[PDB]
Design a protein around this ligand. Structure first.
Ligand SMILES: [Mg+2]
Lengths: 201, 90, 19, 101, 206
């Protein structure tokens, strides 16, 4: 009965799919038109904002709640720290990227061709900021993939459609990442036919 | 102390109301205990409630003004004690 | 709805379609 | 333990607490009547002889359940509506029902 | 420096509700914290250097500052356990993380809009605000709080935004205020609130 009103394209809907297909939840998605599902979800969703989860009693509309509920209720494998010191690191590191980078990509798509450059290169120099650090752990500040990298796998995958890429530096210690996380069955069996033509993988 | 309610039903000419008034007045003397108006003679709370109804000092009308007078005088205890947050904050 | 319980039904129908 | 203190607490729980004697094939509404118990010693539920013609009870082995009205509105319905001194007129007709038999 | 002890570091705000929402849960767990009522134009030095996002409030405990209204009051409810503030069942837990999202995105904009809005919006918002807060009247009869017996964080998102009721020009109107107005007698004068209230935010109570 666990339904999902995912978008077929948007990184948010691609966010939750990585969590579902990772934990092993037996779910069933009901697509949206482009990023607009029907008017028949306003009853279970006064916001009408995808994604939205519905499992027999519940209604939830956010990447925060929808993605952490599936962690606090389907325990293993766990996608978070264990002791309260480090959750605030992960719980806040994902507040960075969801505030700086994600809304930064608005003008790259929802902003005119002038501001597409205004967001393009000022962000690329950030893209290799944590790039050398990948010689610390395999994943983004973790030896075992967790919720924090859940905002990058659906973010990195949207690179060639967006426009910014790797050229010389920024690809030395960085491209090892996407060749290590893009093969996991979770991100393997989460890719859709619409979100796939944004690259050649 | 009370064998028949034939006399405590002439103030209220209806059996199915005598068992409603006295069922409610006989709670005030048990929970949130008020005081039995009659002098009790080592009786329960039920039969004490049925002994006021006969002497007119309780009925379905008196049993509200007796209380709603109190429900707002506790709100007189609201505002007058509301001065306690009036003079405690300045 | 008949007896001691008939009283309280005087009030239930006096709410719906009203206040 | 049946300590000798409870035999004096039990008699104040039964001050004015009507019970509900009722016989088995209850034909008419006079077949259920409350009563105010009085503690005797034995194992037979005594019963005033006038009322035994409402239950239609001979005393040759007939038994009788005894319920207990529990709440506070339910031991007034057993004292106003159902008490045994209110039913001295059978509902089927004005003729009495407590005729000395 | 700032985190040099085992003590906190909170560059709170003296009027901004993010401080006053945090300090309730901040002090409701009985922890020795440091209050610094500071301004946006001129806060203290540490609030701008180690705070590369520069919000209000900002809590710092031996590793880094934590800036948010949610990340803070979550970090304390997950590290200082007793007494508890959020339920156990993850079904009715994240929904308790939903009213907090249906308030910061529902009844926050009615405060900023009344802070920078036109003359009719200030009552238009006060229109959509005052009556709507009466549309939630019968809730309180069932539960002594916002659909939860225990004092939980979803209640703490209300009272700081029920303590600024007339401070931005609001007063109740209609039948059934005795259920909600009487409810305010049950929350507005608690140790978690009484000792926590900023006296600057009090003077709009008379
Ligand atoms: Mg026989």
């Amino acid at each position: 009965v666990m339904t999902l009103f995912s978008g077929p394209t948007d990184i948010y809907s691609h966010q939750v799919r990585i969590v579902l297909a990772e934990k092993g939840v037996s779910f069933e998605i009901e697509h949206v038109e482009k990023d607009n599902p029907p008017q028949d979800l306003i009853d279970l969703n006064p916001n009408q904002s995808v994604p939205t989860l519905v499992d027999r009693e519940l209604t939830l509309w956010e990447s925060r709640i929808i993605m952490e509920y599936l962690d606090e209720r389907f325990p293993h494998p766990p996608l978070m720290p264990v002791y309260p010191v480090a959750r605030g690191e992960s719980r806040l590191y994902m507040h960075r990227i969801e505030k700086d980078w994600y809304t930064l990509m608005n003008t790259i798509i929802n902003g005119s061709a002038s501001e597409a450059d205004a967001a393009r290169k000022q962000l690329r120099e950030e893209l290799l900021a944590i790039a050398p650090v990948f010689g610390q752990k395999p994943y983004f500040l973790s030896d075992e993939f967790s919720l924090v990298d859940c905002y990058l796998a659906p973010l990195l995958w949207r690179l060639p459609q967006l426009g910014i890429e790797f050229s010389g530096p920024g690809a030395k210690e960085l491209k090892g990442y996407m060749t290590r996380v893009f093969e996991r069955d979770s991100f393997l069996a989460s890719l859709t036919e619409a979100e796939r033509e944004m690259r050649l993988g | 102390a009370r064998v028949t309610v034939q006399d405590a039903v002439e103030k209220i000419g209806n059996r199915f109301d005598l068992v409603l008034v006295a069922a409610r007045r006989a709670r005030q003397m048990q929970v949130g205990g008020k005081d039995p108006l009659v002098p009790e003679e080592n009786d329960k709370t039920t039969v004490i409630a049925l002994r006021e109804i006969e002497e007119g000092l309780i009925n379905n009308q008196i049993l509200d003004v007796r209380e709603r007078q109190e429900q707002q005088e506790q709100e007189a205890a609201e505002l007058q004690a509301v001065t306690a947050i009036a003079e405690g904050r300045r | 709805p008949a007896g001691t319980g008939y009283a309280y039904h005087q009030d239930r129908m006096r709410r719906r379609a009203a206040g | 333990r049946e300590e000798a203190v409870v035999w004096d607490i039990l008699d104040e729980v039964i001050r004015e607490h009507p019970v509900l004697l009722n016989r088995a094939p209850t034909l008419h509404r006079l077949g259920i009547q409350a009563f105010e118990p009085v503690l005797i010693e034995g194992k037979a539920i005594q019963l005033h002889p006038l009322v035994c013609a409402a239950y239609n009870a001979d005393f040759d082995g007939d038994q009788m359940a005894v319920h207990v009205p529990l709440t506070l509105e339910a031991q007034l319905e057993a004292r106003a509506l159902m008490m045994s001194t209110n039913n001295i007129l059978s509902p089927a007709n004005g003729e009495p029902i407590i005729v000395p038999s």
